[PDB]
Write a sequence for this structure.
C-alpha cells in the first residue's frame, strides 16, 4: 500500500473493459490513490472474514473471471466518490475523505451486498438469482450511500426510519447510475439480478408495485419481517422521489416533475441537514419540504412538487 500510482485495465462482471486506478509495489494492488484517502478493494476468498486481503495482481491486467467483481467494485466505488464530490461537494462518505473499502468474493453463493458500518461487502451470487453484485452501479452506490447516511442522519435500520434509510440508498444509487450514464433507469439491480430473465429487477422506483412493494402509505407493511419492512416500505418513498423527478399522476394526484438534479439536491439537503436517526415518513416530508424551501423558495414549483408527490403516496 505505499507505492506508485498507476492505471490498469480489466473487464467487469458484464464483460465491459475499463481502466482502474491501481498502486504498484512489487504487485499491482487495487488501491486508488486519486480519490480522497484511497479506495481499496479486497479479496474475501469465499470466506466471511473481513476485509480479507488487499487485492494483488502480478501484471496490472484484470481479465480473469475471478477478477471481474473486484474490477467493478473498485471502479464503481470511484464513480460513486466522484458523484458525491462533484455534485454535492461531499468528500467521501464521512465528508473528510475517509478511505473506501470493499471486499468481494464474500462467502459462497451469497445473494447480497451490504455496508457493514466499516466497509462494503459483495457476494458473488448463486449464478441464478444474482451474478456478482458489484456489477450493478446502482447496487454499489446504494451500499456506499448507507455509509453517507450513517455519518449524517444516522437513520436507525428499523421501521419507518429504516425504510427511509433504504429509499435514500435507492434514490442515490439511481442518481449515480444516471450520473455515469450507462443504461440508466429507475429500477434497482437490473444488471445483476436473474441473469436468466430479461427486463426485471430487484425493486422498481417507477412502479414499486411491479414486485409487490407498496406505492402508497395505506399499503405499508406493518409486521416484523425485514426489520419492519425496510426494503418493502421503501417503495412508498421511492415512488415519491420518482414522482418529484419525473412527474406523473398517481392515485389521482398530479405531480409536475422537477428533474433528477433538483431531486438530488433536495434529498441531499434533507439527509444532511434535517433528518435524524428516528425520523419517520411524516418527518421526511417536512424535511424535504423545508429543503426545497431553503433552496428554491416557499412559493416555488419545487416546493409544490414535493408536497404533491408526498400527497400522491399518502404521506402527511
Ligand atoms: Ca492479472
Ligand atoms: Ca483463483
Ligand atoms: Ca440500468
Ligand atoms: Ca438501475
Ligand atoms: Ca434479470
Ligand atoms: Zn440498503
Amino acid at each position: 500500500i505505499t507505492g506508485t500510482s498507476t492505471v490498469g485495465v480489466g473487464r467487469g462482471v458484464l464483460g465491459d473493459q475499463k481502466n482502474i486506478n491501481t498502486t504498484y509495489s512489487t504487485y499491482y494492488y487495487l488501491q486508488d490513490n486519486t480519490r480522497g484517502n484511497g479506495i481499496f478493494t479486497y479479496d474475501a476468498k469465499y470466506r466471511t472474514t473481513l476485509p480479507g486481503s488487499l487485492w494483488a495482481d502480478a501484471d496490472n491486467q484484470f481479465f480473469a473471471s475471478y477478477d471481474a467483481p473486484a474490477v467493478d467494485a473498485h471502479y464503481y466505488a470511484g464513480v460513486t466518490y466522484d458523484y458525491y464530490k462533484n455534485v454535492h461537494n461531499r468528500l467521501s462518505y464521512d465528508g473528510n475523505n475517509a478511505a473506501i473499502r470493499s471486499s468481494v468474493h464474500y462467502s459462497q453463493g451469497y445473494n447480497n451486498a451490504f455496508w457493514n458500518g466499516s466497509q462494503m461487502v459483495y457476494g458473488d451470487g448463486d449464478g441464478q438469482t444474482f451474478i456478482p453484485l458489484s456489477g450493478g452501479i446502482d447496487v454499489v452506490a446504494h451500499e456506499l450511500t448507507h455509509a453517507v447516511t450513517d455519518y449524517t442522519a444516522g437513520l436507525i435500520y428499523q421501521n419507518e426510519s429504516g425504510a427511509i434509510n433504504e429509499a435514500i440508498s435507492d434514490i442515490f444509487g439511481t442518481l449515480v447510475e444516471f450520473y455515469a450514464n450507462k443504461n440508466p433507469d429507475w429500477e434497482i439491480g437490473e444488471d445483476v439480478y436473474t441473469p436468466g430473465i430479461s427486463g426485471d429487477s430487484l425493486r422498481s422506483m417507477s412502479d414499486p408495485a411491479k414486485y409487490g412493494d407498496p406505492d402508497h402509505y395505506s399499503k405499508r407493511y406493518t409486521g416484523t419481517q425485514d426489520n419492519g419492512g425496510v426494503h418493502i416500505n421503501s417503495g412508498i418513498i421511492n415512488k415519491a422521489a420518482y414522482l418529484i423527478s419525473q412527474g406523473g399522476t398517481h392515485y389521482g394526484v398530479s405531480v409536475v416533475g422537477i428533474g433528477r438534479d433538483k431531486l438530488g439536491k433536495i434529498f441531499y439537503r434533507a439527509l444532511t441537514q434535517y433528518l435524524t436517526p428516528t425520523s419517520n415518513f411524516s418527518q421526511l416530508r417536512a424535511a424535504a419540504v423545508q429543503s426545497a424551501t431553503d433552496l428554491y423558495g416557499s412559493t416555488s414549483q419545487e416546493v409544490a412538487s414535493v408536497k404533491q408527490a408526498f400527497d400522491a403516496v399518502g404521506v402527511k
Summary: The pocket of calcium ion (ligand 1) is lined by residues 57-59, 61-62 (CB under 6 Å). The chain has two domains: 6-154, 155-315. Residues 220 and 233 are 6 Å apart (CA to CA). The first strand starts at residue 4 and ends at 11.
